[PDB]
Amino acid sequence: MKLVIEGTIVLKTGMHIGGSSDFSAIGAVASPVVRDTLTRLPLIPGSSLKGKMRYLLAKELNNGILLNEPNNDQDEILRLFGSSEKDKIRRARLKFNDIKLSNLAELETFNVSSTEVKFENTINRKTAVANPRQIERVIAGSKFDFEIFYNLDDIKEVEKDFENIKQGFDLLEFDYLGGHGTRGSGRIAFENLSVITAVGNFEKINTLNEILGA
Amino acid sequence: MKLVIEGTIVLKTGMHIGGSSDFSAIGAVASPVVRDTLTRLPLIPGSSLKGKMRYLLAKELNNGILLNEPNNDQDEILRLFGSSEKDKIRRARLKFNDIKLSNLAELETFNVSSTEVKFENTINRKTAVANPRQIERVIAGSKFDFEIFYNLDDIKEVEKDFENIKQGFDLLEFDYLGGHGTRGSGRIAFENLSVITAVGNFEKINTLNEILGA
Amino acid sequence: MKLVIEGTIVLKTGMHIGGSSDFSAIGAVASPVVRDTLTRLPLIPGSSLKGKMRYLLAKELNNGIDQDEILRLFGSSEKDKIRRARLKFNDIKLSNLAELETFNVSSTEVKFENTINRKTAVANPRQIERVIAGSKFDFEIFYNLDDIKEVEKDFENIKQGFDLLEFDYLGGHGTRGSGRIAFENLSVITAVGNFEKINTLNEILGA
Amino acid sequence: EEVEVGINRLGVLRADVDNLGQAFINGIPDDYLSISRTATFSRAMSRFFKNYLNQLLAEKSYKINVIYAGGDDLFMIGAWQDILDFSIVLKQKFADFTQNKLSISAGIGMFREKYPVARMASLTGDLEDAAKDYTKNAVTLFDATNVFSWDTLENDIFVKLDAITKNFEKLDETGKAFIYRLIDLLRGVNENQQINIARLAYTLSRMEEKIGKTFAQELYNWANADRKTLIMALEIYILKTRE
Amino acid sequence: TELKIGNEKVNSTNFGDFAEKAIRGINHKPFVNSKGGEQKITTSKIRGILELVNKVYNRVINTNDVELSENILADIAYIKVKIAYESGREPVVKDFIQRTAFTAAITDVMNQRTRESFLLFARYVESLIAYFKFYGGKD
Amino acid sequence: TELKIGNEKVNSTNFGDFAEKAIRGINHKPFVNSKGGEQKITTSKIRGILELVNKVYNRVINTNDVELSENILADIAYIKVKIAYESGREPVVKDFIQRTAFTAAITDVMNQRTRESFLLFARYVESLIAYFKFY
Amino acid sequence: MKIIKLYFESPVHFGEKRLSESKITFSADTLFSALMIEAVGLGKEDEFYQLASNNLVKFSDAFPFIDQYYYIPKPMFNLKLAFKKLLYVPIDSLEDYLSFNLGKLALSEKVQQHDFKDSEPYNVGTFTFKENTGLYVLIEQTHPLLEELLENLQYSGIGGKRNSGYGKFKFEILEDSDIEDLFSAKGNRKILLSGALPKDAELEQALKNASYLLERRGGFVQSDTYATNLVKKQDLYVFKSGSTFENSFDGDIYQVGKKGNHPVYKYAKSFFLEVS
Helix, strand or coil, X not given: CEEEEEEEEEECCCCCCCCCCCCCCCCCCCCCCCEECCCCEEEECHHHXXXXXXXXXXXXXXXCCCCCXXXXXXXXXXXXXXXXXXXXXXXXXXXXXXXXXXXXXXXXXXXXXXXXXXXXXXXXXXXXXXXXXXXEEECCCCEEEEEEEXXXXXXXXXXXXXXXXXXXXXXXXXXXXXXXXXXXXXXXXXXXXXXXXXXXXXXXXXXXXXXXXX | CEEEEEEEEEECCCCCCCCCCCCCCCXXXXXXXXXXXXXXXXXXXXXXXXXXHHHHHHHHCCCCCCCCCCCCCCHHHHHHHCCCCCXXXXXXXXXXXXXXXXXXXXXXXXXXXXXXXXXXXXXXXXXXXXXXXXXXXXXXXXEEEEEEEEECCCHHHHHHHHHHHHHHHHXXXXXXXXXXXXXXXXXXEEEEEEEEECCCCCCCHHHHHHHHCC | CEEEEEEEEEECCCCCCCCCCCCCCCCCCCCCCCECCCCCCEEECHHHHHHHHHHHHHHHCCCCCCCHHHHHHHCCCCCCCCCCCCEEEECEECCCHHHHHHCCCCCEEEEEXXXXXXXXXXXXXXXXXXXXXXXXXXXXXXXXXXXCCCHHHHHHHHHHHHHHHHCCECCCCCCECCCEXXXXXXXXXXXXXXXXXXXXXXXXXXX | CCCCCCCCEEEEEEEECCCHHHHHHCCCCCCCCCHHHHHHHHHHHHHHHHHHHHHHHHHCCCCEEXXXXXXXXXXXXXXXXXXXXXXXXXXXXXXXXXXXXXXXXXXXXXXXXXXXXXXXXXXXXXXXHHHHHCXXXXXXXXXXXXXXXXXXXXXXXXXXXXXXXXXXXXXXXXXXHHHHHHHHHHHHCCCCXXXXXXXXXXXXXXXXXXXXXXXXXXXXXXXXHCHHHHHHHHHHHHHHHCC | CEEECCCCEEECCCHHHHHXXXXXXXXXXXXXXXXXXXXXXXXXXXXXXXXXXXXXXXXXXXXXXXXXXXXXXXXXXXXXXHHHHHHHHCHXXXXXXXHCXXXXXXXXXXXXXXXXXXXXXXXXXXXXHHHHHHCCCCC | CCEECCCCXXXXXXXXXXXXXXXXXHCCCCEECCCXXXXXXXXXXXXHHHHHHHHHHCCCCCCCCCECCHHHHHHXXXXXXXXXXXXXXXXXHHHHHHHCCHHHHHHHHHHCCEHHHHHHHHHHHHXXXXXXXXC | CEEEEEEECCCECEXXXXXXXXXXXXXXXXXXXXXXXXXXXXXXXXXXXXXXXXXXXXXXXXXXXXXXXXXXXXXXXXXXXXXXXXXEEECCCHHHHCXXXXXXXXXXXXXXXXXXXXXXXXXEEEEECCCCEEEEEEEECCCHHHHHXXXXXXXXXXXXXXXXXXXXXXXXXXXXXXXXXXHHCCCCEEEECCCECECCCCHHHHCCCCECCXXXXXXXXXXXXXXCCXXXXXXXXXECCXXXXXXXXXXXXXXXXXXXXXXXXXXXXXXXXXXX
């Protein structure tokens, strides 16, 4: 069986992610936000979510600090997010996806664009001359309905895997998702969290949905 | 009698398949996607689709794990995807084909190219410094009309063969097709599946057509 | 007295045919495609086209259960019965290099590919040289009009073999998406002697 | 199977003495000219090839099967490591025996484990013919496009190979992906000469802090002065160090 | 197939050599910013110039016709605008742009509006960045 | 693709050259301020004009449709009004607008209500200020 | 005396002992065997044999030729006296005698696959001619019959590996007078130009001061009528084409098959270039 980890990511702050691949004007945004280029709808890359979740979860596990490569995590993190060390290679149980902006109609209901420009500057400490920059940034309260595929390979380890997954989401609630996070952006939260089967049925599906629905 | 499995692959995310691993440039897109070099239209090789289908389909059969050489896994897989064992060889009934992008007209109506560049990096966690990464990716919403020739060797096996083919197609819907899939790329979705004859007419084509087109 | 079956072979996919014993460098293309040894122009050997037509025609007749038709088209060296081959194939050279120069692309490419071991999950890359798609191939096939009462069934079998080869690869790794060809601009002309009903041969084959 | 260090290939040596004809017919000059001197000359040549070839292959356990030897003809099939490491030994011992005035040419070929010997011998004979076509002493490494003189092969290729093997051993994470990108640039530089030299300089200063301060500038120097040598040096480096 | 800079033409035999001569002429006579000391352009600005070139180079290499399309030439003219803007801001950028002669190159790309001219320009700038990192790098 | 100024046209291969010629027209024969003195326009006025355009540019390059919306073109009309007002403020701004023909371009954008016409106009304004700062 | 020039647009396989290797040119009885097999294709084989038996059809073997240079194998003398590597000399440069490269030999690797079994490879040695070269065949007193047969042979193919897929050619006569006077000349030593063998009562008179090599000349009978199998030929041994003879001899078309349902002939008639 494979399981699908359905949910949504709601933004409490800006969450500027990414770099185009677009030309810039000389009075407009530098470093614009990354977009799904067919629809020009803002996007969370699955690589960003996977990397931040992996870093936070392998910071909590390995209690304290981590200073090593991704191949030197414990077997929970290696079995959850893949590995590439030379002989003890482990296929990733989790498959993330590119997350498009999902509630565009409810953003347009309040009569505003899907993104914003946030004006910044920096002052030189000796000459007090400012240096403005403009960053494109997604507006707060933007929801991102995501889904993550889980590969049910060992039925006696799925309890610890979903415990670790809920641990990683609960850590990522108290941290930014990408870009200028320490300077007041990126703070997200996780809602509508559930797990469903791909095809068939998993026997203890309720013990996974309860460990994520709290 | 030879049958043609006609359909369409629809990209839900990136699908970065293929590329020369030569140097491209210094500050430009690295590892481009594979293309049909007469048109330089982005391409799905039939080798990628066949290999991923064989891996997933031979993981669902031999229920659970697939820890074996590809020349001997399961007899249904052997008769569907070919064989090369010494005293035991049988032909593949399936003939995959190089798939070319078909909806470039629809992508030109949206004023977007058929490919994009995703910007990535990594954070070397001891020094916390970044290491950027540009990968070419086909855009989402790109359609890939494919044809697979089915060699109907025996009438008594064709319904089980398309039951397995629909099984593998359902398995690919919850997995990625090529490249950095666990980082939010490669997600596909098969649609408009049908089976039509090459020459003449098959009599019980309907049971095949709607065990596969459902 | 003798006929010329002329057409074009248009590639829809790769068609990597052949293996030379040329030494492969370590980071470079192993198994290069067959070429002319003096022009270095990519090529379909006539033995490859002949063998693939013989394969598909022999697998077609005697359905799932060889015959005089196949031996009389492509020869025989059986210990009891020996028949002269009516067909005469030729090595097919690439014709539309003037057209492929217009598109500003070489007539050949490298396809990059690997396998993955299922236990150890380590990839294993390979490069294979391959003709590009959209290539044309002017071919001449000569028929020995030795018997008049059999030429109709013979040309029916030749067009049947062409149509069977239309839905199957021509050479190399065809099961992984290569080798798909199509036959267009098929015509039959005589060169010596004079065949009266050349038009029904043209219509049984160019239909 | 006894070899467990390099690529699982079978290396083939075909050698012959070039300019042996007029040297055997009219070599000893007309002033101090003797008949028994010519007898010693030819009998010593055949004597050398037979007994010194068996003893030079016996004193070190070379994994080489000799098919047949002689002045006109030589054919040995073995592991490619021992064949490559024995070709220089045979060349230098022939130079010592003949006081380095009889030249010698050879051809090294390399084939997989299960390969036919007839096509093997014909291909390596083609290789050594291309070596003797140069019309002096030389050797072909694995292909007719790579023809090197014996001192050129020995000196240049083996000091570059030994320097590369010293440098990339002490490096903990550099090889072999850097070497494959380096070979990609150094074989692209044949056709596109300028931009690959620029990319080469960019990568060498990129990995100046990683591969070594002096080795990167040595690679940049070698890739302009004696280029084609370093490609073969890197290729036989990876062929040696592949597990 | 041959791009003009000053009184000497550059093609696909000399752009690495011309850019090497230009970079090594930037050293041994650097720019002075109207104060006592010299000042040369940093890594980040020339990577900005290279990124501006690469934003078109990523699209041109997958094109068909030997003459560029109009949206490519629009972006080339806008690159010329951006280089003229950033050079007027800081005089250290103006010195690098004039001495490693960039505006003349991009204008003569705009005259002969062909694919090979833009590729020659792009490999010229790529070699220019390459030799700047090769000589006196601060990594 | 198309944007008319007088009887003389500027298109999307070409705006840099008319920005050259427009600024080099502002220089070499500058404004006279009803005095014998010389006067050229300051940085902040023209770049307030740039920020006036870039309040619209950030919502056009972000979008998809080939025709401009009514909110966007309403703000384009607002740009034309603000041009008229800050022309009425200072005579040097009036002659900068009259020589570097800006009202002509903004009326061209209001006539052909396409996305690419405004994007060309934004290219032209950015190039105007680029060649202002270059000299 | 006429010329028969042969322009090959495809590779050739002129085997001499085995399939894996090939030869640059083809012999005279090779061309005569091709003409006999094509004539029994047309049913006119009997009067073609009666033409070639009574000297009105008398051709040499194939020789290399490059642009306006016609070659022969290096005639080998009792010369009492570097150019020792050269195998072919121009046909008119014999008086000067008392650079050159047409094509390159290739080896084509093939296979035969079985469906429920492992494949088996076989390799074919080939030769490909350069763009402005080929082969030429000497002939005297051209006949309408042989002009009709070579017009018909070029759609069946001279060469070995048929009908996969090598030997094909287009011919034209293009007679010459710069080299007809060579063959009208008479000298003291006459060189051979075809694989020949004298009759039994004149081999001694033909063999006086000669310089020759024998060549075995056999193979398998290529027909569907000779005795229900693949029977070998009586291996006739003929003189090599680069021979010299001080006195002339006339060859015969020997019957080297005497057990099947039809005779198998082998052309061994002489063709001399008389020189001082």
